[PDB]
Amino acid sequence: SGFRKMAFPSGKVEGCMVQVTCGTTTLNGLWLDDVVYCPRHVICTSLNPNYEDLLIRKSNHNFLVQAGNVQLRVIGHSMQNCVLKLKVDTANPKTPKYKFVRIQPGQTFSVLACYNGSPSGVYQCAMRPNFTIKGSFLNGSCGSVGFNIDYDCVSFCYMHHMELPTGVHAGTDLEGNFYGPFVDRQTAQAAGTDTTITVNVLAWLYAAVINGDRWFLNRFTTTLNDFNLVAMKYNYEPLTQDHVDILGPLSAQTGIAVLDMCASLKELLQNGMNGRTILGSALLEDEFTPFDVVRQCSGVTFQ
Amino acid sequence: SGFRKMAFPSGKVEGCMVQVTCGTTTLNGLWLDDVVYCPRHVICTSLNPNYEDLLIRKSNHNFLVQAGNVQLRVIGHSMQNCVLKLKVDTANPKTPKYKFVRIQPGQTFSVLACYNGSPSGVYQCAMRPNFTIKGSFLNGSCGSVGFNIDYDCVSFCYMHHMELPTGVHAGTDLEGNFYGPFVDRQTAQAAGTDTTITVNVLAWLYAAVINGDRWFLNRFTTTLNDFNLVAMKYNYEPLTQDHVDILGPLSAQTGIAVLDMCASLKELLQNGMNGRTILGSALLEDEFTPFDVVRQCSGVTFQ
Ligand SMILES: *[C@H](O)[C@H](C[C@@H]1CCNC1=O)NC(=O)[C@@H]1CC2(CCCCC2)CN1C(=O)OCc1ccccc1
Ligand SMILES: *[C@H](O)[C@H](C[C@@H]1CCNC1=O)NC(=O)[C@@H]1CC2(CCCCC2)CN1C(=O)OCc1ccccc1
């Protein structure tokens, strides 16, 4: 037992990380087969930057790619949306099985924070409803990726591009398409209002019950409509029948009907926690999906 | 910016993980050069188990070691305290530079949770003052290790052995010596009373200030003695002058004297948080060391 914010093992991704330098700008690239993927704002020059203009003015040799202490020769470049694709003369021998997938708000992933092509740390993140992520990123971390692992296959979902004024983070999928209404220029962009991921809170309440926290349970129940009236009032997003269905296995393992857990969440929203904690938190946690809870409270590995 | 519970990249450790089977018992082993390290309670037989007796009754071939889908031939075995050392005929070609270090309560490390020799997840843990760790471990996770990384060198500090009745976890250093007053038998052992790691709370308050949370600051100050009178009352462990010294760099970066931050912690203990949060937590967090804060709020990598 126990319940922790758990990231996927990062080794498969560590072997893909490289350093991309243009002029005085250095960030991280993702090296899969003979292509290095990186944010297009690495494109250097001596807001209003036209990246097509900037790139046509560039040569292959303007991009220095370092894989550890080995320099990768760039033989081609192209732009795909907000990412650069640097064709290199060497296929990465550590390329894992992978996919480029775009995730939904509410979904979680692991981030391998990197600087100068060197992995620094790994942590778990959720895509917020407003398409930001509450990450930990400093100068030079751009090009770090987010991912999930499913047996032996790495599903890359996120590449880091920028920080917004509230200290949250914005980026693209691996085809270069931004999550949310953000652009890779310097403007007055701001996150926009967020909501709490209701189905995830319920999943985490089920994790708590699995782990012996039961004090928040009650004998009351509620209808889905009646619950969603309360969710709206506390800035929780609506719960759908599909969310209820997704919570079925957790309901069945604990013997607590989904709508009964909703009754508990309702009382937690209306009353607070009265000095108590759930799974070591004094807040309702919304960054664990039902899959995350099942994975951890049952123990799936990856190879 | 941002602040997250960050683990070290796990790739160097993933390449050391193997599966050790004796009879019907399967757990994880750590394969470094030509030795596999694993908890001695894997020693199988068909509480009061005398492990010396059990081991002398065993043969090399009684231990099945699987490195992925490759079987490792055991050529020797020995007991060192509470760990088994299985000598195998093949040196692990992925052996990183490493050390076996024993950590202090208050210190943090990353855990690579493993099942059947296959890594499942990675998360950050602290050694509690009572020598337990609040982990996430299911059946089969024994032999998973905790570690820190310092440039290219892996400092192994923890190997997992058991769960205590409160759902917390106990284990050994890599020389087989238990952390805390626990034994690898089935008895009525229990964790024993814990305290909050004061110096770490202060480090995390400094992380908050670095990240823009300032509402808990105040103009008051306190003496070290006066602060420690309040710490005792709230089950915080005493703050020493060396803790104050260790917090110096964080003090200097923020311009907030250590004893001034103590005044803030004092008011937080006496008043609670009044519906506010710090770094996304409604509790005072004590599982980040001053080193962890500096590492994350400055960005050290590892290669
Ligand atoms: C890439 O390494 C870097 C990552 C930032 C630094 C601080 N936290 C992060 O996540 N990304 C940037 O600096 C991007 C690049 C930018 C200029 C070029 C076009 C796109 C946008 C500016 N930018 C950015 O994040 O600006 C906000 C910011 C916040 C704090 C510190 C520095 C910059
Ligand atoms: C090793 O994989 C396993 C890890 C446990 C299972 C549940 N959570 C964990 O961290 N360790 C054990 O099962 C140890 C072995 C034990 C018997 C042999 C001598 C030493 C102690 C019993 N034990 C244990 O953890 O018992 C408590 C427990 C708690 C919950 C479920 C099962 C067992």
DSSP chain B: ------BPP-HHHHTTEEEEEETTEEEEEEEETTEEEEEGGG--------HHHHHHT--GGGEEEEETTEEEPEEEEEEETTEEEEEESS--TTPPEEEE-PPPTT-EEEEEEEETTEEEEEEEEE--TTS-B-----TT-TT-EEEEEETTEEEEEEEEEEE-TTS-EEEE-TTSPBSSS--SS-S--------B-HHHHHHHHHHHHHTT--TT--S----HHHHHHHHHHTTBPPPPHHHHHHTHHHHHHHT--HHHHHHHHHHHHHH--TT--BTTBSS------HHHHHHHTTT----
| Separation CA A147–CA B3 (nearest Å) | 19
| Separation CA B251–CA B247 (nearest Å) | 6
| Separation CA B226–CA B242 (nearest Å) | 17
Strand pairing category for A169-172 and B25-32 = unpaired
- As beta bridge partners, residue A169 has A133, A163
CA distance A53 to chain B (A): 31
CA-based Rg of chain B, rounded to a whole angstrom? 22
At B191, phi and psi to the nearest 5?
-60, -45
Whether the CB-CB separation of A191 and A134 falls below 8 Å is answered with no
Contacts of B204 (CB under 8 A, 6+ apart): B278, B279, B284, B285, B286, B288, B293
Whether the CB-CB separation of B40 and B184 falls below 8 Å is answered with yes
Residue tagged active-site, from B41, B160, B161, B243: B41
| Separation CA A54–CA A46 (nearest Å) | 10
Q: Which residues of A touch B210 (CB under 8 A)?
A: none
Token code pair at residue A31: 């090296």
Where does residue B102 rank: exposed (0-12), middle (13-18), buried (19+ CB within 10 A)?
Answer: middle
Place of tokens 């200097």: B252
Calculate ∠ Cα B127-B131-B137, nearest 5°. Answer: 70
Three-class secondary structure of residue A201 per DSSP: helix
CA distance B118 to chain A (A): 6
- As beta bridge partners, residue A113 has A121
Strand pairing category for B70-72 and B63-67 = antiparallel
Q: Which amino acid is at B73?
A: R
Render the burial of B12-40: b for 16+ CB within 10 Å, e for the rest: bbbbbbbbbbbeeebbbbbbbebbbbbbb
Place of tokens 């003090």: B251
Whether the CB-CB separation of B101 and B155 falls below 8 Å is answered with yes
CB of A20 shorter than 6 A to ligand 1: no
Token code pair at residue B170: 């106990």
Whether the CB-CB separation of A123 and A148 falls below 8 Å is answered with no
Contacts of B274 (CB under 8 A, 6+ apart): none
Contacts of A50 (CB under 8 A, 6+ apart): none
Alpha-carbon distances, residue A135 vs A1, A112, A124, A170, B250 (angstroms): 27, 11, 9, 9, 21
CB atoms within 10 A of CB B86: 24
**Cα torsion A95, A96, A102, A106: sign:** negative
Q: Which amino acid is at B141?
A: S
DSSP A221-243: ---HHHHHHHHHHTTBPPPPHHH
Strand pairing category for A97-100 and A153-163 = parallel
Q: Phi-psi bin for B60: left (phi > 0), alpha (psi -120 to 50), beta? A: alpha
The beta-carbon neighbor of B9 closest among A1, A14, A137 is A14
| Separation CA A171–CA A39 (nearest Å) | 9
CA atoms within 13 A on the CB side of B255: 2
Whether the CB-CB separation of B109 and B125 falls below 8 Å is answered with yes
Query: What element of type H or E holds A8?
Result: none
Structurally, at CATH architecture level, domain A198-297 sits in Orthogonal Bundle (1.10)
- As beta bridge partners, residue A63 has A22
Render the burial of A246-279: b for 16+ CB within 10 Å, e for the rest: bbeebbeebebebbbbbbbbbbbbeeeeeeeebb
Q: In which order are the strands placed within the sheet that holds A35-39?
A: A70-72, A63-67, A17-22, A25-32, A35-39, A83-88, A74-80
Whether the CB-CB separation of B14 and B119 falls below 8 Å is answered with yes
Q: Under an 8 A CB cutoff, do A136 and B4 touch?
A: yes
* Cα B2 to ligand 1 centre (Å): 13
| Separation CA B195–CA B175 (nearest Å) | 27
Token code pair at residue A237: 């997003």
DSSP A119-132: EEEEEEEE--TTS-
Token code pair at residue B9: 């990249």
Q: Under an 8 A CB cutoff, do A138 and B299 touch?
A: yes
| Separation CA A150–CA A98 (nearest Å) | 10
Q: Under an 8 A CB cutoff, do B136 and A303 touch?
A: no
Q: Where are the beta strands (DSSP E) in chain A?
A: 17-22, 25-32, 35-39, 63-67, 70-72, 74-80, 83-88, 97-100, 108-115, 118-126, 145-150, 153-163, 169-172
- What's B91-103 look like in SS3? CCCCCCEEEECCC
CB atoms within 10 A of CB B242: 9
Token code pair at residue B279: 């770094």
Query: What element of type H or E holds A198?
Result: helix A198-210
Alpha-carbon distances, residue B181 vs A21, A97, B164 (angstroms): 53, 45, 12
| Separation CA B39–CA A244 (nearest Å) | 42
Where does residue A25 rank: exposed (0-12), middle (13-18), buried (19+ CB within 10 A)?
Answer: middle
CB of B27 shorter than 6 A to ligand 2: yes
Question: Residue B158's closest CA among B142, B141, B171?
Answer: B171
Long-range pairs, B190-195, Cβ under 8 A, ≥24: B190/B164, B190/B165, B190/B166, B191/B128, B191/B130, B191/B132, B191/B164, B191/B166, B192/B130, B193/B130, B194/B128, B194/B129, B194/B130, B194/B132, B195/B129, B195/B130, B195/B235, B195/B236, B195/B237
Where does residue B61 rank: exposed (0-12), middle (13-18), buried (19+ CB within 10 A)?
Answer: exposed
* Cα B41 to ligand 2 centre (Å): 10
Whether the CB-CB separation of B86 and B94 falls below 8 Å is answered with no
Place of tokens 């290790």: B145
| Separation CA B265–CA B221 (nearest Å) | 10
**In this structure, what is the dihedral angle of CA atoms A284, A288, A289, A290, given to the nearest 10 degrees?**
-80
B169 belongs to the catalytic site: no
Whether the CB-CB separation of B239 and B224 falls below 8 Å is answered with yes
The beta-carbon neighbor of A9 closest among B3, B5, B122 is B122
Calculate ∠ Cα A53-A55-A57, nearest 5°. Answer: 75
| Separation CA B219–CA B260 (nearest Å) | 8
At A229, phi and psi to the nearest 5?
-60, -40
Q: Where are the beta strands (DSSP E) in A55-168?
A: 63-67, 70-72, 74-80, 83-88, 97-100, 108-115, 118-126, 145-150, 153-163
Q: Under an 8 A CB cutoff, do A300 and B120 touch?
A: yes
- Cα A65 to chain centroid distance, Å, stands at 25
Question: Residue A144's closest CA among A260, A56, A26, A229?
Answer: A26
Whether the CB-CB separation of B70 and B76 falls below 8 Å is answered with no
CA-based Rg of chain A, rounded to a whole angstrom? 22
Whether the CB-CB separation of A202 and A109 falls below 8 Å is answered with no
Which of B22, B24, B84, B162 for a ligand 2 pocket mutation test, highest count of atoms within 8 Å of Cβ? Answer: B162
**In this structure, what is the dihedral angle of CA atoms B224, B230, B236, B238, given to the nearest 10 degrees?**
30
CB atoms within 10 A of CB A180: 18
Whether the CB-CB separation of A302 and B68 falls below 8 Å is answered with no
Whether the CB-CB separation of B271 and B230 falls below 8 Å is answered with no
Structurally, at CATH architecture level, domain A12-88 sits in Beta Barrel (2.40)
Alpha-helical segments (H) within A71-139 = none
Q: In which order are the strands placed within the sheet that holds B83-88?
A: B70-72, B63-67, B17-22, B25-32, B35-39, B83-88, B74-80
Token code pair at residue A242: 């599909």
